[PDB]
Amino acid sequence: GLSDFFTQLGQDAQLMEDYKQNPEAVMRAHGLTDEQINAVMTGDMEKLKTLSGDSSYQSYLVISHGNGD
Amino acid sequence: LSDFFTQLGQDAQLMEDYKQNPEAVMRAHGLTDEQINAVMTGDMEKLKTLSGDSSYQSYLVISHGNGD
Amino acid sequence: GSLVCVGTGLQLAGQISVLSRSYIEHADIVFSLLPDGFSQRWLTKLNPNVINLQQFYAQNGEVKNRRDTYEQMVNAILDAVRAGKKTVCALYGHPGVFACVSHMAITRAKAEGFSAKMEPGISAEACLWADLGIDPGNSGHQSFEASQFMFFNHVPDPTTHLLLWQIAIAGEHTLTQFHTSSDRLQILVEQLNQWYPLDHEVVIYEAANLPIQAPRIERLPLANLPQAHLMPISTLLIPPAKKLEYNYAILAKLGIGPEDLG
Amino acid sequence: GSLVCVGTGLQLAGQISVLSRSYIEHADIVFSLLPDGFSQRWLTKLNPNVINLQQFYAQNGEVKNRRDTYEQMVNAILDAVRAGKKTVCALYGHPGVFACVSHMAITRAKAEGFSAKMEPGISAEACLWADLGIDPGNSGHQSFEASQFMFFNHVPDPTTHLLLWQIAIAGEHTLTQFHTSSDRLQILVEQLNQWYPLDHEVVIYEAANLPIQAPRIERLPLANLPQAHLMPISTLLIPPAKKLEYNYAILAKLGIGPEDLG
């Protein structure tokens, strides 16, 4: 439900412009809980990842270094 | 020509078929001998001729280096 | 009314981002600046309500300052936003890289109280790293507009990959011509000779716009640049003239040396 | 076998190219390095045959040189290609920008006689220009990896926008820790003070990965950097310390002055 909404929102410009008009209305209409909505509105990405079940996905995004040849 | 190039640019399946056998894929999609020759010699100008353009004025400079 | 500026990338149809294509699809009106007729056809099939910004460039030998062209493009976009249209500006490449019209229109739209934003896209330089197999992080990267490099004080780091954009108009101070002269490029060569030898191998790069087309990757000595064939889309890549050397001052403060590097 | 390396951009699902998404769709196997679990699920729905490259990073407090991680990633990719698989590498951002695994994999695949190529994507720097409303062409742009700037001799041009990537590991010489320390960042501050005053306003930037998420755009004086909260994805933007000044030397060779500029 969280992951499904975010995937749709990220790809569909019609839903993105609806969302930007009224974020709370759009998240309620796609079923997000009050605690999920609260997490979005406060910018708490760690809690969203808790609530999605993702908990302990190890994401380290460094693919280069500055030490040369 | 235009329909073929639009499909080819978006469809990785067709792109990989094309890269295996450019002349076969181009013939199958109806390109003429002259069009295929223009592709194989890199003559973008003649390709635009054969597509019928009226040589679409395409200047694409959207900045300058004079400040302010 | 609202404004969203998107990029279409360099390659026909497939290099636009999924979300950026959806913005074009759902727009009331699209203002376009695209590389060719194939791209124009593709756009028109996506959304038939298109105004072609190419019309604002000098026509038929007219003398017109490009500042006026850009002002006219911005005003045309804003007239649609002011009327109430859900407006999209579809530029080739990335709409905010070596491209003033989208930044200007977004600034003006916000000042007049409208919603305006920019979506990133794939630029000519993003294409260059891919096509040449170069990582800009390898020894770092620098980018300048070629004329700005000549008219103002800029100092390149010669350990980095250096890009001069808009090389075909290097030194064209009037902003009214479409190409420069070989004498202007000779002065640029002499200027670069402060850091790069005359026999230094440089690369003239042009990203492809059609799927059947190979990019232009022409290698030549710097001395030969003023005789080379250049187009408005050409960019000059100047590879490093020296290798990275150890910064002993900072290594000491860090309390390490070369042998300690992982 | 064959190899195509693609990027997925920074934002979930929508910032990938139309073509790059098609490559993922049609691959026999995908090697992924993606920002989060939402992105991982999106990929898996596109193509269920995925191997997650994240496993090659140090786990559970192990000491591992990142050069070994990258070798191990390159080797995994090539083992699928050598076996005969139509292989796609799907990295976040642009697969060849501040990313060695793809260039190394492509070099190795070509040397062993396999077809290999890289498709450009939207990098974090592409996202920064859009989010901050900055054109790198305005006064020029330079990019360096922060530790490379500390360990080797690089000289920034203070009229440009300067980017230091991987600022969170600045000075981490062992390539075995995931973050640097406050004292290392103080040394960087002292180094930068050669060109930038201590009260110079700098920006910590982080591109958003989810569509409901705002980018991080934190403005602070350079002096406060060592006390800032930084994450592996953080970039430091250092805006110009000086305005553009005329290059009277080159204007004279061109036979013009400032008053002649269009």
Numbering used by the authors:
A (entry chain B): 3 to 71
B (entry chain D): 4 to 71
C (entry chain C), D (entry chain A): 2 to 263
Question: Could you pull the original sentences from the published paper?
Answer:
Here we report the discovery of type IV borosin natural product pathways (termed ‘split borosins’), featuring an iteratively acting α-N-methyltransferase and separate precursor peptide substrate from the metal-respiring bacterium Shewanella oneidensis. The α-N-methyltransferase SonM from Shewanella oneidensis MR-1 iteratively methylates its substrate SonA at two residues, SonA-L63 and SonA-I65, in an N-to-C terminal fashion on the core peptide. A five helical bundle at the N-terminus of SonA, now referred to as the borosin binding domain (BBD; 1–53), serves as the SonA leader peptide and is homologous to a portion of the fused clasp region of OphMA.
While SAH is bound to the protein by an extensive network of interactions, the apo structure reveals the presence of water molecules filling the cofactor’s cavity. Most differences between the structures relate to concerted rotamer changes due to steric hindrance upon SAH binding. Specifically, upon SAH binding, the side chain of SonM-Y93 relocates by 1 Å and the side chain of SonM-I234 rotates nearly 180° to increase the cofactor binding pocket volume. Interestingly, changes in SonM-Y93 conformation induces a conformation change (up to 1.8 Å) of the side chain of i−2 SonA-MLE63.
